Design an enzyme around this catalytic site. Structure first.
Site, short mmCIF file in Angstrom:
data_model
loop_
_atom_site.label_atom_id
_atom_site.label_comp_id
_atom_site.label_asym_id
_atom_site.label_seq_id
_atom_site.Cartn_x
_atom_site.Cartn_y
_atom_site.Cartn_z
N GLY A 104 24.08 33.68 -3.16
CA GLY A 104 24.63 32.44 -3.64
C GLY A 104 23.62 31.73 -4.54
O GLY A 104 22.58 32.31 -4.98
N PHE A 141 21.50 29.46 -3.93
CA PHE A 141 20.23 29.10 -3.35
C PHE A 141 19.76 30.15 -2.31
O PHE A 141 18.76 29.90 -1.61
CB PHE A 141 20.33 27.68 -2.76
N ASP A 175 33.80 26.51 4.28
CA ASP A 175 33.75 27.47 3.17
C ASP A 175 34.18 28.87 3.62
O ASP A 175 33.66 29.89 3.11
CB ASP A 175 32.35 27.56 2.57
C1 LIG Z 1 29.79 44.88 -1.33
N1 LIG Z 1 29.57 44.32 0.03
C2 LIG Z 1 29.18 42.91 -0.05
C3 LIG Z 1 29.16 42.28 1.33
C4 LIG Z 1 28.35 43.11 2.29
C5 LIG Z 1 27.85 42.54 3.46
C6 LIG Z 1 27.22 43.32 4.42
N2 LIG Z 1 26.68 42.79 5.59
C7 LIG Z 1 26.32 41.56 5.99
N3 LIG Z 1 25.94 41.41 7.26
C8 LIG Z 1 25.49 40.19 7.57
C9 LIG Z 1 25.37 39.16 6.67
C10 LIG Z 1 24.64 37.88 7.02
C11 LIG Z 1 25.35 36.69 7.59
C12 LIG Z 1 24.43 37.46 8.44
C13 LIG Z 1 25.78 39.44 5.37
N4 LIG Z 1 25.63 38.54 4.40
C14 LIG Z 1 26.14 38.75 3.05
C15 LIG Z 1 27.66 38.53 2.96
C16 LIG Z 1 28.16 37.17 3.41
N5 LIG Z 1 27.66 36.10 2.55
C17 LIG Z 1 26.49 35.49 2.74
O1 LIG Z 1 25.78 35.69 3.76
C18 LIG Z 1 26.06 34.58 1.65
C19 LIG Z 1 25.28 35.19 0.49
C20 LIG Z 1 24.37 33.90 0.49
C21 LIG Z 1 24.85 33.63 1.92
N6 LIG Z 1 26.26 40.63 5.04
C22 LIG Z 1 27.16 44.69 4.24
C23 LIG Z 1 27.59 45.26 3.05
C24 LIG Z 1 28.16 44.48 2.05
C25 LIG Z 1 28.53 45.09 0.73
#
Ligand SMILES: CN1CCc2cc(Nc3ncc(C4CC4)c(NCCCNC(=O)C4CCC4)n3)ccc2C1
Ligand SMILES: CN1CCc2cc(Nc3ncc(C4CC4)c(NCCCNC(=O)C4CCC4)n3)ccc2C1
Ligand code: NA
Lengths: 273, 269
Positions: A19, A21, A132
């Site tokens: 994102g 930040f 969100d």
């Molecule tokens: C193309 N795909 C995009 C999304 C994604 C997420 C993951 N695994 C994942 N596991 C945990 C988390 C974090 C919360 C603990 C995570 N976080 C990224 C996705 C959610 N958005 C955010 O956290 C915002 C990015 C700035 C905060 N993503 C694995 C593969 C992929 C590949």
């Protein structure tokens, strides 16, 4: 070469989200290298120069322990940065899943929605609103990567940087001394956006069913114009939608808070029963 | 004797205010010891454990340069703390002034209110709502009413009206956000107008317009009463009465606009 973050590490190649930040990487424990984690770096310095607030993601995730909300394992503070070491969701996000599957069955929608509801129950009990929710932060986790049918999917809500406590303004007033000067709408604000997440969940379910969001526009300003200029929004629901899912969508996708379905009605809704 | 903060210093004995996670001291430049400053310490560690958000006081004060808003001269950041070195107001706060005066003439109210309005104008331009205006953070700087400069302080509860809308713009998908989140700019936009209403009332009458036992009792009152009539003395001028009634509207939608406040005939006199 690996970046070290306390007892964990990650490669800059394994970016899974970003994102304005924050960046999030897949990483691992440095010793137990089979323990995968998500490592988020938040740029506190840049945030401090912006109108957008830092938020309470650490406190909120620390306070929640629930199977449908990402766990927080560790925090490392720096002067200009903070790292959160969190649960890794090996399935990616709901957007990735929709990209592969197109639209989902009602039965799949129900399975997912039951888990989303369970998360919303804990948030509701604690007076926390996410604000969100979207396909990009509704994550999929396979506890056994061999069992990759729908029944093997655990849903986890993530990214609580925009989340807020409904009671924070009332807490401010308690601590400020005299609240006799504060605006009524400030004192009473608990009761304004309390159902924001119900609308979001509405839009997500809709997109799962139909394959696009219920309301599209060129830019964010154009969508804001739309919501402003249309005070009674009718979502276009496919006529083949089951009676209960149609009903659930109509009650969630009410433009006006006061007309929108309550949480107790959402959790009790026959689509979910 | 003295705590050092960059080019400044203060004694812990010279406390001039405190809140939930902050203390403010009168201090001075270490060389130019006749340059008095206000030095604020914010306990970020305690704040992080509470529901109350880290605000934007540094950014707001850094970005403003206006004679009716306290200047920011320096910031010193520590792991658990931050110091703000700010303009010192040698007259204290408006509450202290009311303690001496009892109530103010309409003419004095008008002189002060012109300056408060000027501060509110710059905040309004920048999309800032203070949200905690009160006699304790409307400060007086003396160099009689013609000598007195008003300065607004304590922006730790302040918010930017457009921040939700800006978050959405920086998402690229605002598509899942609730309408009331996207459009919340139009919810507490007039919070400061109510507050100023209560302050003017207190200046005129010598108490706030609506008292309760406790904060939860006042919340109950505003909830239970969907309109609210302040008790205005009959000898109040027509324009001041009108200004008070229009500011002290319980419901945002009925409350006087900013443009109507800044142009109000009470101020045009
Ligand atoms: C193309 N795909 C995009 C999304 C994604 C997420 C993951 N695994 C994942 N596991 C945990 C988390 C974090 C919360 C603990 C995570 N976080 C990224 C996705 C959610 N958005 C955010 O956290 C915002 C990015 C700035 C905060 N993503 C694995 C593969 C992929 C590949
Ligand atoms: C009885 N006494 C009332 C308060 C006061 C303030 C001052 N001069 C003053 N000048 C500037 C400042 C502002 C820039 C920091 C200041 N701040 C204290 C008063 C406003 N309240 C606050 O700032 C909150 C307290 C936690 C933040 N106070 C002088 C004498 C007295 C006398
Ligand atoms: Na400045």
């Amino acid at each position: 070469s690996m970046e070290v973050v306390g007892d964990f590490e990650y490669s800059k190649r394994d970016l899974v989200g970003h994102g304005a930040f924050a960046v999030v990487f897949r990483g691992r424990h440095r010793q137990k290298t089979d323990w995968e984690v998500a490592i988020k770096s938040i740029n506190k310095k840049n945030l401090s120069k912006s109108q957008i607030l830092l938020g309470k993601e650490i406190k909120i995730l620390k306070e929640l322990q629930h199977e449908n909300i990402v766990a927080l394992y560790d925090v490392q503070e720096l002067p200009n940065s903070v790292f959160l070491v969190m649960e890794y969701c090996n399935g990616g996000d709901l957007a990735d899943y929709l990209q592969a599957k197109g639209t989902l069955s009602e039965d799949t929608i129900r399975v997912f929605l039951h888990q989303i509801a369970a998360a919303m129950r804990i948030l509701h009990s604690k007076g926390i609103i996410h604000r969100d929710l979207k396909p990009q932060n509704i994550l999929l986790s396979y506890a056994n990567r061999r069992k990759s049918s729908v029944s093997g999917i655990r849903i986890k809500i993530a990214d609580f940087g925009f989340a807020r406590y409904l009671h924070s303004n009332m807490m401010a007033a308690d601590l400020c001394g005299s609240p006799m000067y504060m605006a009524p709408e400030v004192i009473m604000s608990q009761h304004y956006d309390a159902k924001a997440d119900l609308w979001s969940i509405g839009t997500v379910i809709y997109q799962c069913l139909v394959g696009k969001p219920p309301f599209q526009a060129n830019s964010p300003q154009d969508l804001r114009m739309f919501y402003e200029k249309n005070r009674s929004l009718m979502p276009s629901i496919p006529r083949e939608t089951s009676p209960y899912l149609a009903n659930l969508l109509l009650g969630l996708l009410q433009r006006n808070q006061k007309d929108r379905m309550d949480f107790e009605a959402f959790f009790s809704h026959p689509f979910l029963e």
